[PDB]
Design an enzyme around this catalytic site. Structure first.
Site, PDB file in Angstrom:
ATOM      1  N   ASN A  85       1.273  33.167  -0.614  1.00 29.55           N
ATOM      2  CA  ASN A  85       1.795  33.906   0.578  1.00 29.55           C
ATOM      3  C   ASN A  85       3.402  33.612   0.648  1.00 29.55           C
ATOM      4  O   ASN A  85       3.742  32.713   0.814  1.00 29.55           O
ATOM      5  CB  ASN A  85       1.356  33.163   1.948  1.00 29.55           C
ATOM      6  CG  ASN A  85       1.941  34.052   3.178  1.00 29.55           C
ATOM      7  OD1 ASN A  85       2.617  34.776   3.140  1.00 29.55           O
ATOM      8  ND2 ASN A  85       1.751  33.118   4.304  1.00 29.55           N
ATOM      9  N   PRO A  86       4.249  34.758   0.052  1.00 31.86           N
ATOM     10  CA  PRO A  86       5.680  34.690  -0.068  1.00 31.86           C
ATOM     11  C   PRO A  86       6.294  34.683   1.268  1.00 31.86           C
ATOM     12  O   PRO A  86       5.788  34.985   2.322  1.00 31.86           O
ATOM     13  CB  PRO A  86       5.909  35.891  -0.725  1.00 31.86           C
ATOM     14  CG  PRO A  86       5.022  37.006  -0.105  1.00 31.86           C
ATOM     15  CD  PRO A  86       3.642  36.087  -0.109  1.00 31.86           C
ATOM     16  N   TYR A  88       8.817  35.625   4.022  1.00 30.88           N
ATOM     17  CA  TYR A  88       9.372  36.897   4.894  1.00 30.88           C
ATOM     18  C   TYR A  88      10.420  36.838   5.441  1.00 30.88           C
ATOM     19  O   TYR A  88      10.916  35.773   5.560  1.00 30.88           O
ATOM     20  CB  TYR A  88       8.177  37.409   5.767  1.00 30.88           C
ATOM     21  CG  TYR A  88       6.761  37.274   5.475  1.00 30.88           C
ATOM     22  CD1 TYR A  88       6.210  37.053   4.034  1.00 30.88           C
ATOM     23  CD2 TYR A  88       5.845  37.272   6.519  1.00 30.88           C
ATOM     24  CE1 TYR A  88       4.856  36.880   3.894  1.00 30.88           C
ATOM     25  CE2 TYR A  88       4.778  37.099   6.216  1.00 30.88           C
ATOM     26  CZ  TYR A  88       4.118  36.969   5.035  1.00 30.88           C
ATOM     27  OH  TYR A  88       2.738  36.912   4.746  1.00 30.88           O
ATOM     28  N   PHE A 176      -1.650  35.549  11.922  1.00 29.65           N
ATOM     29  CA  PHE A 176      -0.779  34.301  11.839  1.00 29.65           C
ATOM     30  C   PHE A 176      -0.647  33.938  13.360  1.00 29.65           C
ATOM     31  O   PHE A 176       0.337  34.478  13.965  1.00 29.65           O
ATOM     32  CB  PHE A 176       0.718  34.391  11.057  1.00 29.65           C
ATOM     33  CG  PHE A 176       0.212  34.868   9.508  1.00 29.65           C
ATOM     34  CD1 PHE A 176      -0.095  33.856   8.615  1.00 29.65           C
ATOM     35  CD2 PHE A 176       0.371  35.918   8.981  1.00 29.65           C
ATOM     36  CE1 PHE A 176      -0.371  33.916   7.423  1.00 29.65           C
ATOM     37  CE2 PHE A 176       0.139  36.326   7.553  1.00 29.65           C
ATOM     38  CZ  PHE A 176      -0.025  35.390   6.690  1.00 29.65           C
TER      39      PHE A 176
HETATM   40  N1  NEA Z   1       3.758  29.613   0.551  1.00 31.42           N
HETATM   41  C1  NEA Z   1       3.874  29.619   1.961  1.00 31.42           C
HETATM   42  C2  NEA Z   1       4.889  30.587   2.631  1.00 31.42           C
HETATM   43  S1  NEA Z   1       6.477  30.510   1.831  1.00 31.42           S
HETATM   44  C3  NEA Z   1       7.091  29.020   2.321  1.00 31.42           C
HETATM   45  C4  NEA Z   1       7.487  28.117   1.059  1.00 31.42           C
HETATM   46  O1  NEA Z   1       8.181  28.888   0.103  1.00 31.42           O
HETATM   47  C5  NEA Z   1       9.073  27.984  -0.407  1.00 31.42           C
HETATM   48  N2  NEA Z   1      10.244  28.878  -0.869  1.00 31.42           N
HETATM   49  C6  NEA Z   1      11.006  29.902  -0.143  1.00 31.42           C
HETATM   50  N3  NEA Z   1      11.787  30.559  -0.702  1.00 31.42           N
HETATM   51  C7  NEA Z   1      11.577  30.109  -2.186  1.00 31.42           C
HETATM   52  C8  NEA Z   1      12.005  30.691  -3.430  1.00 31.42           C
HETATM   53  N4  NEA Z   1      12.984  31.551  -3.571  1.00 31.42           N
HETATM   54  N5  NEA Z   1      11.511  30.224  -4.480  1.00 31.42           N
HETATM   55  C9  NEA Z   1      10.505  29.203  -4.698  1.00 31.42           C
HETATM   56  N6  NEA Z   1       9.905  28.682  -3.387  1.00 31.42           N
HETATM   57  C10 NEA Z   1      10.443  29.252  -2.291  1.00 31.42           C
HETATM   58  C11 NEA Z   1       9.671  27.250   0.822  1.00 31.42           C
HETATM   59  O2  NEA Z   1      10.261  26.027   0.208  1.00 31.42           O
HETATM   60  C12 NEA Z   1       8.562  26.769   1.325  1.00 31.42           C
HETATM   61  O3  NEA Z   1       7.745  25.751   0.822  1.00 31.42           O
END
Ligand code: NEA
EC number: 2.1.1.72
Length: 393
Positions: A85-86, A88, A176
DNA sequence: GTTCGATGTC
DNA sequence: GACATCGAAC
């Protein structure tokens, strides 16, 4: 930000990887997806997680943790499976947008992503990055907002996915808690072609996919939930966009700096209207919701069509069609403004009634559900209008 | 010119 | 839920 168990389970049920394959979870934090995949499919895989915040990286000893910005990450080998889950959000000034980074960094993202368009979004970039990291035949499974199915900002992303492999989209909706977003799960395979659209059914046992439609030759077109009814209605009339030029209201900043605009009511002054002034079938010309006032006759200085009575359609009242005829011709700060094209004959009163009819509301609701909190131009253009309301000579 | 929102606020 | 962002971004 956490992903509901049933969502992860559903996504894991869609994932696949060869024995000894490389499995990856971007923006993993503690790695909910790697854990769930391992518990469901075994330990015969190479588990990798990428996290940018050290305080968040916390994977089990059987997984490989990497501290890095996923979007600029350059691994040595590609992966067989990428799930997660990236994050947003739009990258921009903190007073208006959620993602804050150095301009130089945003520049690097722009350089790295061929699908980056307009303001774009972090999730669109993660999708493109993951696909590029996918080995031929590899599979990707992400849960992201549904906005990319219809918005222009994601036209290149759709076109990219269409040419890079086969795509399946599963609509979830607002799954969510305390998170205002309509989501979809996308299962992408770097091979084959086509698009498959699925709806889902939620039960205690979890999510069950329901095949809705298939587009074997999808090339990146806007994705909608079509039915025999929507199709029948669309060919029954002329697309609204063929009858009207569609423009949008001048923006708040333009009004705010215009010398004729005031922050207080006064003689000869009239309010600059907003979506709150537009109702189904009529316009509230008295109430002020913008905090801006100006002489009516000067409105044409910001947009020439403000001087002509015309049809107005709402943009931010959710996915529905709210229209009214602005007979007075007022200055607007929001909404769509439709000017009839040369030779177009119309019946304002009847066209307005058609646009606000229950039939029309169901039409757009069926096609676009709640992907986005608007009626976008792309949606508005395709609204069918029969001869009874508008006729092109 | 006009786009988009892990929306913003009641 | 009601009801819509509104201005930075290109
Ligand atoms: N997988 C959960 C939803 S996204 C939130 C997570 O993504 C991480 N995160 C945000 N931007 C990121 C990036 N560019 N690369 C790697 N991890 C990232 C944040 O630190 C947080 O742990």
């Amino acid at each position: 930000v956490e992903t509901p168990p049933e969502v992860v389970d559903f996504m894991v049920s869609l994932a696949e990887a060869p024995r000894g394959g490389r499995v990856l979870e971007p923006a993993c934090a503690h790695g909910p997806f790697l854990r769930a995949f391992r518990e469901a499919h075994g330990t015969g895989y190479r588990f990798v997680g990428v996290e940018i915040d050290p305080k968040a990286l916390d994977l089990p000893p059987w997984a490989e943790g990497i501290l890095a910005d996923f979007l600029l990450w350059e691994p040595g080998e590609a992966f067989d499976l990428i799930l997660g889950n990236p994050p947003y959000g739009i990258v921009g000034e903190a007073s208006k947008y959620p993602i804050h980074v150095f301009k130089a960094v945003k520049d690097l993202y722009k350089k790295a992503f061929s699908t980056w368009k307009g303001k774009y979004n972090l999730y669109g970039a993660f999708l493109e990055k993951a696909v590029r990291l996918l080995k031929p035949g590899g599979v990707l499974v992400f849960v992201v907002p549904a906005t990319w199915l219809v918005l222009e900002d994601f036209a290149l992303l759709r076109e990219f996915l269409a040419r890079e492999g086969k795509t399946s989209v599963y609509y979830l909706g607002e799954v969510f808690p305390q998170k205002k977003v309509s989501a979809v799960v996308i299962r992408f395979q770097k091979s084959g072609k086509g698009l498959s659209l699925w709806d889902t059914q939620e039960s205690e046992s979890g999510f069950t996919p329901i095949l809705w439609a298939e587009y074997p030759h999808w090339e990146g077109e806007i994705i909608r939930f079509e039915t025999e009814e929507t199709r029948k209605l669309e060919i029954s009339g002329m697309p609204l966009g063929d009858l009207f030029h569609i423009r949008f209201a001048a923006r708040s900043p333009e009004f705010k700096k215009h010398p004729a605009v005031r922050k207080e009511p006064g003689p000869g002054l009239v309010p600059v209207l907003t979506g709150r002034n537009l109702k189904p079938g009529w316009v509230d010309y008295e109430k002020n919701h913008s905090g801006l006032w100006m002489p009516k006759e000067r409105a044409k200085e910001l947009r020439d069509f403000y001087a002509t009575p015309h049809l107005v359609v709402a943009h931010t009242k959710g996915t529905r069609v709210v229209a009214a005829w602005d007979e007075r011709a007022y200055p607007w700060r929001e909404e769509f403004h439709l000017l009839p094209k040369e030779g177009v004959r119309l019946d304002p009163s009847s066209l307005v009634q058609w646009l606000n009819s229950e039939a029309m509301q169901k039409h757009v609701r069926t096609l676009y559900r709640d992907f986005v909190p608007h009626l976008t131009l792309r949606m508005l253009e395709r609204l069918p209008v029969r001869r009874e309301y508008g006729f092109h000579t």
